[PDB]
Each structure stands twice: as structure tokens, then as C-alpha cells.
Amino acid sequence: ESWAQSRDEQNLLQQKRIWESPLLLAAKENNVQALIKLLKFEGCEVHQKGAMGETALHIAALYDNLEAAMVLMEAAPELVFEPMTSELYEGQTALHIAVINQNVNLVRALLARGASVSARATGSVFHYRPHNLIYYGEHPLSFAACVGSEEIVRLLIEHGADIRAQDSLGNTVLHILILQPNKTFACQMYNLLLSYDGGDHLKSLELVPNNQGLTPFKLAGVEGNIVMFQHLMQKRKHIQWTYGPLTSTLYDLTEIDSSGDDQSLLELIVTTKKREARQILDQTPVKELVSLKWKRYGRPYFCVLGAIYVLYIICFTMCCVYRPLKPRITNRTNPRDNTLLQQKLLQEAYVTPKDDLRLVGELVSIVGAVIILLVEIPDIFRLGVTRFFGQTILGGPFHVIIVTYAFMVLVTMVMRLTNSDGEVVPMSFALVLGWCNVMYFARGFQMLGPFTIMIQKMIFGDLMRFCWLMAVVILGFASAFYIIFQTEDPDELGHFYDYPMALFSTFELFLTIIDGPANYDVDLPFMYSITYAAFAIIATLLMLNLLIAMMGDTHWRVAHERDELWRAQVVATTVMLERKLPRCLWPRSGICGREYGLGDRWFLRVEDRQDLN
Amino acid sequence: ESWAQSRDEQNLLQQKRIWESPLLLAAKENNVQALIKLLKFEGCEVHQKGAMGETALHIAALYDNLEAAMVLMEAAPELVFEPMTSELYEGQTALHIAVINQNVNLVRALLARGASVSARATGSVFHYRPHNLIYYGEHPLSFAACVGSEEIVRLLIEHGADIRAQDSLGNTVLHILILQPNKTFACQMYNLLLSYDGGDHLKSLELVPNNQGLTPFKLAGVEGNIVMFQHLMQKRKHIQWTYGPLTSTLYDLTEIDSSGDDQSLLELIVTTKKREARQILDQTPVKELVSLKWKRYGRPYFCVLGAIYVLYIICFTMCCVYRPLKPRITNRTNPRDNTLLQQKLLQEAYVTPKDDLRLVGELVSIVGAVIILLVEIPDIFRLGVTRFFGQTILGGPFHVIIVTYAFMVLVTMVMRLTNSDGEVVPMSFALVLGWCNVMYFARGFQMLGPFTIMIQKMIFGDLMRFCWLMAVVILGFASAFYIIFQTEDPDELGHFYDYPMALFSTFELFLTIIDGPANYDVDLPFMYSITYAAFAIIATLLMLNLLIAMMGDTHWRVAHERDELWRAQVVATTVMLERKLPRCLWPRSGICGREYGLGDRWFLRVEDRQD
């Protein structure tokens, strides 16, 4: 990009000023003997700049020079307050740089001389963007508490570093630590922050969400943080009793699901994209709910919703094959090739009640296409069109077939009551979608779930890299088969009588479903045989018989993700019905309070086996 | 099922009535100071109940609070004789808790005051059910003898704990040690139980069957336990001699062999469904019977009975193709689709003695149909209605084919001397099932054997998850194709002239056997060439060529669970034959007894090499 080259030009111009401006060079080389000479009788210069507008203190801070910064604090005791000011770096101060480079004795010096511990690091490089490497928030407490320098963490809080602090993204200091991938310390560094949460108001520092409304318990599951999730879980897990090897424990379940307002954690999991945000389902309180919500309640309602669906498509199919048809309205087979002896009725014949019994049947299937549009036009009303044509399998392309099937039946309603000739065209797409859409209910089955994802994976993923190989090879030999048979009879051996037939014939000799154009009464032209024998090798025993190995390579190599997706297919099916079915038949999952002195949070009982003495 | 929920509902109620009645509350947190204050002057309360009617002494022990338990015995010396009075906890007295929770000093003191160390505990959580976690039996001696605490085992017997004591499941202590999963101590504790057995006037301890008639050597074999089955063997394995590295060794074979009285270990293994039960059949006093019982006597008797089966079908197959047929009795010429010009005879045509030669062919093939219904009735009458329709592959679905074969042959017998027209249809199943039922004799072959398991394993498990993914698609495009060609002639391009043919002709295009319809003289409707192309992409290179990789993935994943089943398939043939044939051509396995100075137990000799 043109933007990333701008970072290169400045950072080389940043170094050019260091080869100029001799005190900055004296600052980089830890040169103190020149720096006394360049200041203590003439000086004249002390508020220097660079390419990023930094000072000699910042230069003496980026390279670890306690001696050089010692003279600079003594020379001008107002260097410590002003920040960097540029496009990329903005608002960063010498307190920040001294933190990230772990320089404990320098931070001890700067706080004694007076440094702003609330300096906003509002620069351009600091934003949480994937083309930046590290994201440490803004405040100098966050820069310490992320790299794990817990001594400086203790050093800052003694000088009035506020824990409550939000960035431009609304994140607090606990939202940050969940985001570093090299975790390793952030179990321990988490607790040191709560050890300074001793005296506050009623919001106990974890009930403070981000800008998009997401507490650090919620943020741990959304970001795929297995290590920090169990560390948070130990806080809200209550152990009831132990009895030899049986330990029964309670779980909080106040935000695990508690699917009662808008932002249940089970809803947040099956919307995301991250591969590791989906294995929270492995963990011990969530793998109980989505089992019990599905097995006692979710499974039988889903089949009743499925078994009512098959009887709908049949009622549409049973009124499809009973179209009104006339025998051969007006014409008589004029050139050739008019194998067409029928005509549909005008809509002036609904007499003879087994043509009227269908009329109450289509009215069933014409209101069935209204209710599907009424349940999916309010789906783009809440979340955008990138949900449909995004390839999120958790409710995948089964939301673009059912709309088109709903959209096609109304076109038949438009093709009816206008008396237009061509109207097999919506009804042909109406059946090939309306039957292939009962594939959606192959989802909650034990044996037929994870097969369906493999069909969905080879349609796009491993046939959009074969059809571009199919359409090229066909376009050669189909055009080549035209030229050979151009000066020939289409009567005897007539597989190619024009070019739009000549693809359709050649397309099926590639798939080996038609036989292969051969006649023996007549003498085929000699270039037909050489051309077709090269077609038969490359297609039949080099392309199709490559593709069977192409599947089998990619079949055993991803059969540990389809067992992860299929479980998440069930969960997104479960929560979809919880926010849709009215609460007369799904009770709230778990055990409530206030019959027991509990605290009104809905709880859930878990008992396991300790297997040690 | 709200019952396990109802377990969870009551567990909070104990934890609510403990916050009331504060001596129960102090009993949890062993507050010895306040417990003095609630007792020494007024008290008035000590016979408390909980949600399950439990005591303060229970809660003082359910949490290991020994100091508070000291005061309760001194204040109330009557609590130790009364049980928990509920459904979920019935009969569990205060001793049961302190045993499982390993409390040495409390059991030393509770028996010092003296508790019933033989009282029974029969709550709903304690019965041997798959939903409860641990099963430690009923009696308090069993609870010590399942956790590994050898001292409490030594302590209870000194105070009068009867070892020989059965539960409602009839299990002893020695049956229950077999059932814990992580053994790790139980084999080491197994010696401690038989140390206290004396061998009295009564029968010795391991000769006690359970409530379902089963000894603790059999129950190590049914449950798939290996490590107990090793340790049980050394008490009955006699060393003959050694010769350098060689050891010739004489095994007991008292109960391992069939020997009549059908509760035998080689019987009880291949009837059960536990997967690790068939892992026993590699242990050395078992794998050598089933070699010698099969190699010298199970191999030829099975194949000779195999050859009389092939001669049975051919004597029906030649009998089938020689029916009597008249040319076209009285009808003529439905002017289309009436290719029907032969008609079977009424049974008034038994002239021409190549019908008399056929008459013995029917009667040979009609008696074998009866003898199957005399050999296979004594299995569903011997409780096999859940075994045939059960998918126990050890004798799999070949037992439901052969009854269906014998049923259709007798339907044919009804068809003759009734002169009903449809005899082709029941005779048509009598060939595709009769010939495919010779596949059962491909069991005892070195080579052909474990392939037949994969055929049985693909029909149920990797094809029935594909036939549902066909009848969806193949019902889509058949009703699609029929509407396209509805305004078209059936005379030319008549692949779909009515709708039941339109499914059947679609079913073959999905398998690539018909060529796909085409007729280059007549102009196809333009919606045909769009649809059929997209049906030939789904079928040929996306569904069929995916079904092949479904096969090839799971083949090398059960390529070592068919070499487990086939070895267990052979043994289930030998044991089935051994009780069926009279023991006059079968010798009994092993060497005899009292002809040598032995003691009548049928022994067996196996010699090995050490290293």
C-alpha cells in the first residue's frame, strides 16, 4: 500500500536528523562528555525536534541511557511533560517509553521529577489494527500491566494511577490483558489488579463493559482465551460438598447463558469467526447446558418443526404435477422437432372439483411463501446482508435458498392470472430448491449431521477449483469437435449440429454419462479419432480419477473440524429457538433462587469424580 | 426426565435447613465454642432432621469435622443407631460417611461407642445404575474395601464384620472390587480379603454365585477386566516342570470350558455386548482352547455343513427355473405394453416325467424349509427376540434372513394347490435371499472372513447416512424432470411418461447406468438442458465421488476392529456347534482326571519359552 511506505520514509528521516543535530547523536551514543560541553556554557537549543517531533529526552529514553537522561532532566526540567506530536506518534511521553523498555530506575526518576501518569497515547500506531503488531491500550498503567513488569505496576499505583480507564475503543485495563496472545503472565497479572480493587463504589471494576458492551468475562469467550476463561470461572464457582470421590459444585450461570436480554454468551459464540472462540463449548459449564437444552427440549421441537416442513413441500409438489393442460392449442408441428403436444389452460377453467381441490391446495402453499418472507425480511432488518453471502456455516446458505424458494412461488402467482406461456421456469426452480431445503433438517441428527457439512465444503472449496479446470478443457474440445463435424451430416451421428448443442454434448462426455459419438455404418473423418482419444484420456482417467483422490486427500485431513462444527451447528440451532419460541414451554434452564436463600441468580448443579486420594 | 433434576432440587434444601437450626450450622464449621453454648444449659433440640432426616453427627462427619463430632457423642450417645430416612439416602448411617472420607479416628471412636457394622444401606443413589457415579455396595465393609484403606479393612473385622454378606444385587465384597475402574489397589487388596477366609465347614468364598448365578471368576471375564483375570489365574495355574527356558504348565479348565450346564465363560463372553469382553480371548488359557477346538474339530465340521448348504440352494435353484408354463391362456393384445405371452399351468399338469423328476426337487427343497423352522424357533423361544433384531454381529442378521427365506418358500407352497397368479413375486425373494445366505459360511475362512464384516458394517453405518441424502435429491429432480417433459411426447424421448416411472428413471441416472436422455432429431425444451447439467454435477462428481471417499476414510479406521471381530466371529461358531452336535464325534477338550492321580478336574497342558 502507499500508506505503509510512509512509515518507512519517516523512520529513515527520523534517523537522518540523528546524524545531524549533534546532541541527539550525543544522546543516542550515551555520550555525556559532549553533552556537558554542548549545554553548560552555550546550549541554545534544548527544545529540539525530530521527524516525529520528539525531544532528546525521548531519544535518551528509547535507547537505555540512565546517564544521558540524568543530565537532560537536570538541564531542562520541563522536558518530562511535553509529548511527542506527529501523525503516527501522538501524545506519547517519556514515561511511556521508559515503561515498555522495563527501565525501573528511570521511571523512579521521572515520577520524582513529576510525570503525567494519565498521558493519553492517542497516536496512530497504537490503534487496535491488524497491520500493527502490539496493542497496549493508552495509559502508562496499561503499558506496564501487559508486558508483565509487576514491580512498575506497584510503582505507578503509589502515585495515583487510576485503574478505571477507558481508551478510544472503550476497553479498560482488564479488557487489554485478554488480548495479548503470549499470555504466560496474565493469569498472575490479573490478580494484582484486583488486589488494588479494595476501595471503590458499587461497580466492582469488572462490571464495566467496553464501548461495544462486553465485560471481561464476556470478552474472554469471544476472543478465544481458554487459559483466562477458566481463571475467571474459578471466581464464580461455588463448591457444595465433597463425599469421598463425589464433589458436587454449583455454577453461577448469570452470564454463561442467562438468555434473557440481548447479549448472552452462547449467542456471542456462534456469531463470531475465530477458530478458537468456538472451543469454549469444550469447557465444563457450557458443555452441560447445550446438551440439556438440546436433548430434553431442543431436539423434539426441532423435529416437529421439521416434520411439519416435509408435509408442506409435498403439498406444494402434489399441486405441482396436477397443472391444468390442454391438448395442442393451435399449431401443427411445422418444420421438424416440435415434440410438444400440450398447452396449459387459460385461467378460465377451475371447474371439475379435482381441479378445484388443488385450488385449496395451492392456497396452502401460497401463504406458506408469505410466512417465510415475513420471517426473513425482519432478518436483514436487524443484521446486514453480509450475514447471508458471508460463508458462515452456522446457519449457512440455507438462508438464501429458502428466500429464493419463497421468491419463486410468488412469480408463479404472477405468471398465473396474467396468462403468460413460460411458467415452468419458476416451478422447476421451485422444486429443486424446495426439496433440497429439507437438507437443513439433516442437522440435529446423530449420524447425518456431520455428513452434510462435507457436502457444503466440497461445493465451494473443492469444486470452485475444478469447474475452472472443467470449463477450459471443454471449451477446447467442444469447439474442436464442432469443426470436425461441421462438414458432416447431423442426421447420422448428429451429436453436434450447432455450437450451443456442442457444449452440452461435450460437457457430458467429460462426465462420462453419454456414451460417445460412434456410428459404424458410415466412415467417420480421421481427425475425429485422434482428437477424441486425447479427450478420453485427459477427462476419464486423468481428471475425474484425479478428483476422487482430491476428495480423499481432503477428507481425512479435516475430519476433526466437522466434529467441531457439527457441535456448534447444534448450539446455534438451540439458541435460535430460545429467542424465538415463547416462554410457556421452554423453562429457564437451571435452578433459580429465593425458594432457597440464594441471591436470585439462576444456578445449575454439577457433580463429578475426583480420582485421587 | 425431571428425576435427576429432582435430585438437584433436594440438594439445595439440605443447604437451606442447615442455615436454620444453628447447631447444624456449627456442625459444618466445627464451632466448638458455640456448640457448647447451644447444648449445656437448654439444648431442647438434639433430635434434628435435615432434608433427608440426617443428623448433626452426619454433618459433623460429612465435612471432616472430628472435634465437633467428639462433643456430639459425649452429649448425645444415641445418634449412631439411626439411619438417614429418605429415598435418596436410606439406611446410610453415620459409619458409612466416616469410612468413605477416610477418617481413621472417627471410625475408631464410633465403633468404640459401638455401631451396627452390618446394617444395610439402600438409598436410591446407591443402587447399581448407570446414571450414578460410584457403586460401593450396601454394607459398610464394602465401602472400606473399594477405596483402598487397608486399615479400616483390618479394623472392621476385629469388631465382628461378616465377610460373606450379599446385597440386593447378590454381590459379595469380592464381586464389587471387580467393578471399580481404576483398580490400582484392588488386586493388592484382593489378597487381604482371602487372608481372613479360613476355609471352614461352609464352602470357600469364591464359590458363591450372585443374584444372577455367576462366580467372581466369571464376573472378571464378563466385565472385561484383564488385571483381575490375570490375578485370578495364578491360583489355579499349576507348574509342571521347567527345562532351561522352557516351562510346561498345566491349567485348571474347570469352568472355562463349556462342558454342559450352559453358564460357562466361553459361553458368557460371546453373548454379551461389552466391548472389552472380547479382549479376554487373547489370554493364554483361553486362546489355546479355541484354536484346538476349531483347528482339529471346528474347521472341517463347519465346511462339510457348508457344502450341504450349497447343494440345498442349487436343488432349489434348478427347481425354480423349471416351472410349468402354457403359452398365453386366453387373452390377447392390450395394444401397447402387453409383452406377456406365457402363463403358468393350473395344477392339473404333472404329465411328462421331467416333472416327476422335479417333484422330488420341490420336496427336497420343502423339507429343508421346515428344518430351519425347527432349529431357529428354539432361539426366540429361548429369549432371542432382542438378539436377532439386536445387532450382535456374532451371529448377525443372517439369523433373520434365514427365517425370511424359509417363510417365502412356504408362501410358494401355499401358491401351488391354490392357483393364485402371483407366484413369481414370493419366489423372487426366495433366490436373492437364499443365495445371499451362503455368505454366513464365509465366516471360518482365513481370507474371505473379515471382508464380510466390512460389508455388514457399511450397510449399517456408512450407507444409511447416504440414502437419506439421496431420496431428498432424487425426489427433487424427478418431480423437476417430470414437469419439464409433461408437455412433450412420450412416443419420442419417453424417459418420463408418468410419475412413478419418473422416480425410477431418475434413480438410475443418479447411479450412471442409463445414458441420460437425448434425441438429436427433436428439439428439447430449453429448461431441460439447464437443469440436467446441474443434476449431473451433483450426482457424478459431488455425491458419488464423495461416497467413495466416505468409504476409504473409514476403512483404515476400522481395519483393526474387524480383526477383533473376526476372531470373535470364529469362537461364536465353535461354541454354537459344540452344544448342537452329540458328543460322540466330539471328544471333550483337555486331558482327563482320575485316570491319572489328579482329582477329576479336566486339565490342559501348554508349554512355552521364557527368555
Ligand SMILES: [Ca+2]
Ligand atoms: Ca450406453
Ligand SMILES: [Ca+2]
Ligand atoms: Ca454408460
